[PDB]
Amino acid sequence: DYNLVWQDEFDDGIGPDWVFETGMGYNGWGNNELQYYRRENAAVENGNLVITAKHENFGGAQYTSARMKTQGRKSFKYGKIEARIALPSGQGLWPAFWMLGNNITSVSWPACGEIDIMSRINNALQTHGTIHWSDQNGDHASYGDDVGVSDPGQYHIYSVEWDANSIKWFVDGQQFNEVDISNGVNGTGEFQNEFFILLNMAVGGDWPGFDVDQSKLPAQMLVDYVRVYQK
Ligand SMILES: [Ca+2]
Ligand SMILES: [Cl-]
Ligand SMILES: [Mg+2]
């Protein structure tokens, strides 16, 4: 049986387990992204975390947004990891709810492993669920799928169920992807370690492309809560 082990409900403020990232990382957070992250772009309104992407000139970038992680504060080995999220739509927008291995600090990416619980680009009427890792040959590996979401601007539940043998993805309880990780098959051993959680909204990058509909800015990603259950 799944029992609640951690949550952030965003009742009146951002909880104690989040660290905010700033700037453009290395080569636009490794994806040629166009936003400069700032603390100012994350706030709480009416029981939701609000991450706002803005058309705003700052530090050589023309967009600002927020990126938050639980690294060094909260991490999990296995569980049902989920969030209740409403998404804005617009060419260039790239929201995500995801996880990275704690060992990123020693083995780097993608060897640390990455679980993308939800990602979306532009105005797509679908969302994605993906893993990234370093396979048995030491090569960058990825495995993903997508599911139709009629109105991503409404709230939906995005989750993964992760155990020693598999990762399963769901939107509103509907499974749309599964990966076998049992005994570290296909060099997936890295998914047997602790992972921390991230939330962000990028603007532009390799995946969504470099055209941005600035008439959709400021754009708000609404996160009602993040919850983690374990059995
Ligand atoms: Ca809430
Ligand atoms: Cl569990
Ligand atoms: Mg709704």
Q: What is the DSSP string of 28-54?
A: IIIII--EEE-GGGEEEETTEEEEEEE
Shortest-distance ligand to the CA of residue 48? 1
Known binding residue 1? Answer is no
Residues 6+ apart with CB under 8 A from 68: 14, 18, 19, 20, 21, 42, 51, 198, 199, 200
Angstrom distance (rounded) from CA 97 to CA 13? 19
Segment holding 102, helix H or strand E: none
Residue by residue, DSSP assigns 49-101 as EEEEEEEEEETTEEEEE-EEE-TTT--BSSEEEEEEEE----TTEEEEEEEEE
Ligand 2 mean position to 225 CA, how many Å? 19
Cα 13 to middle of ligand 1, angstroms = 10
Q: Any idea what DSSP says for residue 10?
A: -
Q: How many whole angstroms from 204 Cα to the centroid of ligand 1?
A: 28
The radius of gyration of the chain from alpha carbons, rounded to an integer in Å, stands at 17
- Ligand 1: centre distance to CA 225 (Å): 5
Give the structural domain span for 226. Answer: 1-231
Instruction: Identify whether the C-beta of residue 201 lies closer than 8 Å to the C-beta of residue 221.
Output: yes
Residue (of 126, 132, 191) closest to 164 by Cα position: 191
Which region, left, alpha or beta, applies to residue 194 given φ > 0 means left and ψ of -120 to 50 means alpha? beta
The experimental technique behind this entry is X-ray
Separation between Cα atoms, residue 150 and residue 129, nearest integer Å: 17
| Number of neighbouring beta carbons within 10 Å of residue 25 | 14
Distance CA 87, CA 147 (A): 15
Q: What are 220's strand-pairing partners?
A: 52
Ligand minimally distant from the alpha carbon of residue 155: 3
How far does the centroid of ligand 2 lie from the alpha carbon of residue 27, in Å? Answer: 35
Do the Cβ atoms of 183 and 166 come closer than 8 Å?
Answer: no
Distance CA 231, CA 123 (A): 36
* Interatomic CA distance for residues 29 and 36, integer angstroms: 10
| CA 89–ligand 3 middle distance (angstroms) | 15
DSSP H helices, the chain, are 104-107
The ligand with the least distance to the CA atom of 79 is: 2
The Cα–Cα gap between 61 and 42 comes to: 18
Tell me, in angstroms, the distance from the centre of ligand 2 to residue 175's CA.
18
Closest CA to 145 of 116, 172, 125, 123: 116
43 Cα–ligand 1 center, Å: 12
Residue 121 CA to residue 137 CA, distance in Å, equals 30
Ligand 3 centroid–CA 69 distance in Å is 25
How far is Cα of residue 133 from the mean position of the Cα atoms in its chain? 16
Q: What percent of the chain is helix, strand and coil (3-state, nearest 5)?
A: 10, 50, 35
The residue type found at 38 is: R
Resolution in A: 1.5
Tokens of 132: 């990234």
* Token pair in block for residue 102: 């704690």
Distance CA 69, CA 99 (A): 9
Ligand nearest to the Cα of 5, by number: 2
144, 129 Cβ separation under 8 angstroms = yes
**224 annotated among ligand-binding-site residues:** yes
Enter the tokens of residue 186: 């296909």
The ligand minimizing its distance to the Cα of 162 is 2
Domain count, the chain: 1
> Strand pairing partners for 128?
119, 146
Q: Count Cα neighbours of 211 within 13 Å in the Cβ-side half-sphere.
A: 4
CATH code for the domain in which residue 220 is found: 2.60.120.200
Angle 103-109-110 (CA atoms, 0-180°, nearest 5)?
Answer: 105
User: Could you tell me which of 145, 144, 147 has the C-alpha nearest to residue 174?
Assistant: 147
Sign (positive/negative) of CA torsion 225, 101, 121, 95?
Answer: positive
Structural tokens at position 17: 């387990």
Instruction: Give the count of beta carbons closer than 10 Å to the beta carbon of residue 161.
Output: 19
Q: Are 104 and 96 in contact (CB under 8 A)?
A: no
In degrees rounded to 5, what are phi and psi of residue 215?
Answer: -70, -15
Residue 221 alpha carbon to ligand 2 centre in Å: 28
Is 132:140 a contact under the CB 8 Å cutoff? yes
Which residue in 119, 228, 142 sits closest to 188, CA to CA?
142
Question: Which DSSP category does 215 fall into?
Answer: G
The answer to whether 47 is a known ligand-binding residue is yes
Task: Give the rounded distance of the alpha carbon of 221 from its chain centre.
Answer: 12
